[PDB]
Write a protein that binds this ligand. Structure first.
Ligand SMILES: Nc1ncnc2c1ncn2[C@@H]1O[C@H](COP(=O)(O)OP(=O)(O)OP(O)(O)=S)[C@@H](O)[C@H]1O
Ligand SMILES: Nc1ncnc2c1ncn2[C@@H]1O[C@H](COP(=O)(O)OP(=O)(O)OP(O)(O)=S)[C@@H](O)[C@H]1O
Ligand SMILES: Nc1ncnc2c1ncn2[C@@H]1O[C@H](COP(=O)(O)OP(=O)(O)OP(O)(O)=S)[C@@H](O)[C@H]1O
Ligand SMILES: Nc1ncnc2c1ncn2[C@@H]1O[C@H](COP(=O)(O)OP(=O)(O)OP(O)(O)=S)[C@@H](O)[C@H]1O
Ligand SMILES: Nc1ncnc2c1ncn2[C@@H]1O[C@H](COP(=O)(O)OP(=O)(O)OP(O)(O)=S)[C@@H](O)[C@H]1O
Ligand SMILES: Nc1ncnc2c1ncn2[C@@H]1O[C@H](COP(=O)(O)OP(=O)(O)OP(O)(O)=S)[C@@H](O)[C@H]1O
Ligand SMILES: [Cl-]
Ligand SMILES: [Cl-]
Ligand SMILES: [Cl-]
Ligand SMILES: [Cl-]
Ligand SMILES: [Cl-]
Ligand SMILES: [Cl-]
Ligand SMILES: [Mg+2]
Ligand SMILES: [Mg+2]
Ligand SMILES: [Mg+2]
Ligand SMILES: [Mg+2]
Ligand SMILES: [Mg+2]
Ligand SMILES: [Mg+2]
Lengths: 222, 218, 216, 218, 219, 221
């Protein structure tokens, strides 16, 4: 797949690089939306982990809720030692999680981390729609200027309803991935869809995946 | 990887691949009469009986006397467990005559140390406020090291996980109890929707409530 | 294991495995004309006639006179029970208001030595708060209470404000379901805290003798 | 066993469905979507009282003018103008020019003036609508009027009326439907509720023809 | 002395309505986008002029007269000629790229000026909308106009019009639908209600042709 | 004039058949769709074909995507827009947000570009409904005065719900096209529908299409 306009970097997540016809568009952001426990955080961690392990590309993980400590503990579920990557300066977890007890400043923290750690991959996890739209638009634009390739996760509450919470997120993003966890006849089945990738082709519709001891495994069928 | 403690609730430790994640909170959501209080009581009762692990039950609606009375239908002598100092029922109900999260936490905390409890149950208007408040309760409980069941309400069997559409997102673990109409009959089911950082069986599993509490069939 | 009082409403004590738990409140919710008031009235009437248990009926909209006139069609003479001091109808109907209501209810309960209470018919937090306090106080008093509420759909929320079923000990749902062009009445005990009951919907009719439920 | 007395509408089929007609001294809510026959039912009620039983009636209108009411009733061969001339029908015009306490006095005055037994009324907090409609029902009750009051609704199988409260404050509720299925319309009438008395249940098909409403109980 | 009807001469419609539109009254014609509302209102005036020499007033609130005229040439109708002959007046109430009373006075003036028998009107609180519409309807009735007034709706099988009140202050209601099923569109017309008179019930299929609306028998 | 409205060919395969000749001249066509339905692609292909096939210059007005991304992404369809910009055949007007709105002023700037580049085709890409309606009405009217033939895209959130976002856009527009991206049985199917063209005829309902290395391809029948 060399005849496409947009250079892509490989997630090395089994099956995803096939669905995306080469990986995530470089220097752009990809929205990854899903209901609770669909694998958003896992996808964003796996993106960073693979970048470090496979290509020695440093990553920055920005967390807004889960603590770094819990992110690290949970990744051990997959045999990933993120503490060691942090110790080696290859992974930086930026803690923006609220005190257990603005955006401008946040963006500067991110930029600082990206420069300090030489980061090539970024993951960001995770009331007026128009305000959300402009703020997200601003975040996306700043990351692009910096040159980062970014996964940003968002929540949604229905498997076949709005893409994210505010009805605007999918429109200001260059790339949109939807993780679903569909309940039918009392069974759950996980799927991944690439809804859009601006300027390039991709496989369409839903593709099954599982979450196992090895992380996400996606199965393309086309 | 995260360790789990056995609930000894029949069938549940299979569905959860070992029980509830230790040192974390598990959200248990369901419409009215789905078995939420029962699940949270059975969690502490089995902790005491099977493992000599004391428990703290935090009630916001039902009086301790009613919690005790309602458990007799299952042959659980909760009055005896309270008399022995193995179960503490913390009453946080608003007295019909005459909210601060930080006070509750300290009371829970001292109860935990006083009774040397390993297991806690908590039973049970801006979504953004709810989200932040729940996030703080979960964090503070985690800081104490308590393994906690916390129940919440929902109003549809196949709609939102909880009431404000945010509860499942700040919870580490989520269990849904349903009570579904099948023709004119009801069918109860239990689902483990998610457990962060660990594995579990997927989808719904039928259960019944009997004289011995919750009985699940994987 | 918990003591129940018999409603003597045909079929209902079978569905509730012996009647309504004594000293607790039971929510009875339904759309319009589902039989809520009838259930409430029958609960008190049977208590008086069969068990000499006095009752207090609390009405918020229907006048005492219409309550009495409507019951008359079931052959139930409520005016006579009121005359004998076995029934008190408390008129709360229009031209903490709650605390004033509670005190009035308490007084009637003490005065008439009532064992049974029926209460016939905005922000969720406020509703939940007020209702919880009403229920808690009746419990302290030791009343066994039927509390009716409205709902607007047969298979939607239990009651109007989405909280009523969560603060009640017991929940009964009266439905009047349209199937094709025919109506079918059903009763369901959704929940009885601390005890067993039959599950799901059971058909009933309303006749000259009141509610008649068939649980088999 | 003392029955609720009823007065016959002589609307064909309806006195079978209602087991004798409308409850005397009370108000019956007649609700439906646009063009379901609400006004027709309310007029046929008054017209039949006058012609069959020599019971005069008051028609209270809030939007259609008297002249249009009269004009439209000509469709069915009824001469309302003549009945107004004879003092047997009074159309009370409460329609706006291109409050409730005042209206009630107006209606009471008209009832007393014309020996009227039958009244038809044709036709934003839900809480205030509820309390206001309640008062209207109550004062009509004291006068001893037997009243048809129409309301609008916007869905064939949605709320009984517009504000989700009107059915709960009415003693009696009739629903007129105009159901669209597979490009064809079907008129049905349902008596949902009559407090204190019996009635047939569910929907009964009807047509509107040159003779007004014809209901088919079989 | 039941209410009489004026023929629309719209193929199929006068059968459905058992004679046409009730004279001296207003008929609501509601529909989703591109359902044929303007076409119906224009064809009503056009046929009145061509068949009965009854002059018409068309009141436009968005579309310019120029575009109304231009679009009607799709059907082989020369509205510019009819305006020039004084048979039709297109009253421009469209805004430059609200007082209902003033509008009503302009419509009355036009009806008197052109001796019009036929009028088409194309096209925040419901209580306000209800009151204003009722006023407009009442005033057109006192004038003696037979009126078609179009309204928008956003669902094919949802409310009649946008505010949930328009169908209740209208004497007459026609619904145009453009139903999408299995990737194909089907146009239908329904007479929902005609106060004080009879009409056929349910949906009737129609097409928009080079010569305007054609309505066919059920099915 | 005395003729029914004339149309300009889009040369988008299959579309000029569906529209019986192309887009109505001197008017605006709304093109609405959920995310990634091909709205920007449709609006670019309209300008691109105008330039290449008829030497009709074009103005593209972008409200969020930067000109440089518009140009970069169009390379996916084999089009060199930078070359067209260099030759003065295409002008991309950047109305996108400074990362850290007066439609009347914007309209005048669109007019400058239209007059400067002698453009015949315009594409515009892409919360009180009364306010939306009035502003959209004024934009449509001013474009019609200028005489431009315009594609304007809008967003929608459901495949079979509202045409656009505010329930008014499809009513003030002369022409409406809906792009859908329907998910059934885990597969997506793209369709195009011409819902309405005031004053002229068109085929009805949905027609399937794909996006290829040569742009939009609407299947026959
Ligand atoms: N070793 C494992 N084997 C199988 N499944 C696992 C394993 N570890 C974790 N999981 C699953 O992965 C899910 C967690 O995925 P996450 O990426 O944390 O979800 P999420 O979409 O970020 O959800 P939130 O943030 O809690 S709403 C758990 O709910 C389990 O189903
Ligand atoms: N060479 C290609 N072959 C096949 N599909 C392609 C190709 N290039 C792009 N696409 C598709 O075109 C889509 C982008 O189309 P656009 O016109 O940008 O959609 P859009 O409706 O404008 O979406 P927005 O503005 O991001 S909401 C991508 O999501 C791909 O699916
Ligand atoms: N001995 C028993 N046998 C069978 N079912 C029982 C028995 N005891 C209780 N139950 C059932 O258990 C239900 C009570 O379960 P709970 O755990 O109190 O429900 P809950 O979900 O907490 O409901 P709330 O708090 O009132 S909304 C009752 O409604 C009965 O159906
Ligand atoms: N003698 C009777 N025989 C048969 N059915 C009767 C008789 N009396 C009343 N009914 C029925 O009982 C219904 C009234 O039941 P209620 O208990 O008053 O209803 P409800 O749920 O309280 O309704 P509200 O308060 O008006 S919303 C009537 O609508 C009839 O269908
Ligand atoms: N002679 C007739 N033959 C058959 N149907 C008729 C005849 N006269 C009137 N109708 C029908 O009766 C309907 C009018 O009934 P109404 O009682 O005015 O309805 P409505 O429910 O009061 O509607 P509103 O007030 O306009 S919302 C018309 O729409 C016709 O369908
Ligand atoms: N010659 C023609 N042959 C066939 N159909 C035509 C012809 N001319 C126009 N049409 C159709 O008529 C429709 C326009 O009808 P209108 O009366 O303008 O609809 P409308 O309901 O008023 O839409 P608005 O006002 O834009 S929401 C177009 O969308 C075409 O489908
Ligand atoms: Cl899985
Ligand atoms: Cl059970
Ligand atoms: Cl019955
Ligand atoms: Cl009919
Ligand atoms: Cl057609
Ligand atoms: Cl495609
Ligand atoms: Mg996560
Ligand atoms: Mg409980
Ligand atoms: Mg009642
Ligand atoms: Mg009427
Ligand atoms: Mg139009
Ligand atoms: Mg775009």
């Amino acid at each position: 797949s060399e005849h496409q306009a947009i250079a892509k970097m490989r997630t090395m997540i089994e099956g995803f690089d096939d669905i995306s016809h080469g990986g995530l568009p470089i220097g752009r952001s990809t929205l990854v939306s899903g209901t609770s426990g669909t694998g958003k955080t896992l996808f964003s961690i796996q993106f960073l982990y693979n970048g470090i392990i496979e290509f020695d590309e440093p990553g920055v993980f920005v967390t807004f809720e889960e603590t770094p400590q819990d992110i690290i503990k949970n990744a051990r579920s997959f045999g990933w030692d993120l503490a060691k990557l942090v110790d080696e300066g290859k992974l930086f977890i930026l803690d923006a999680s609220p005190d257990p007890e603005d955006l401008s400043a946040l963006i500067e923290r991110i930029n600082y981390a990206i420069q300090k750690y030489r980061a090539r991959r970024v993951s960001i996890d995770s009331d007026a729609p128009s305000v959300v739209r402009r703020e997200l638009f601003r975040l996306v634009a700043r990351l692009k200027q910096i040159g980062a390739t970014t996964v940003m996760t968002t929540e949604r509450i229905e498997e076949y309803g709005p893409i994210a919470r505010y009805g605007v997120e999918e429109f200001v993003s260059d790339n949109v991935v939807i993780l679903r966890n569909v309940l039918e006849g009392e069974r759950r089945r996980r799927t991944l869809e690439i809804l859009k990738l601006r300027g390039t082709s991709h496989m369409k519709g839903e593709y099954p995946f599982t979450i196992t001891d090895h992380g996400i495994n996606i199965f393309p069928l086309g």
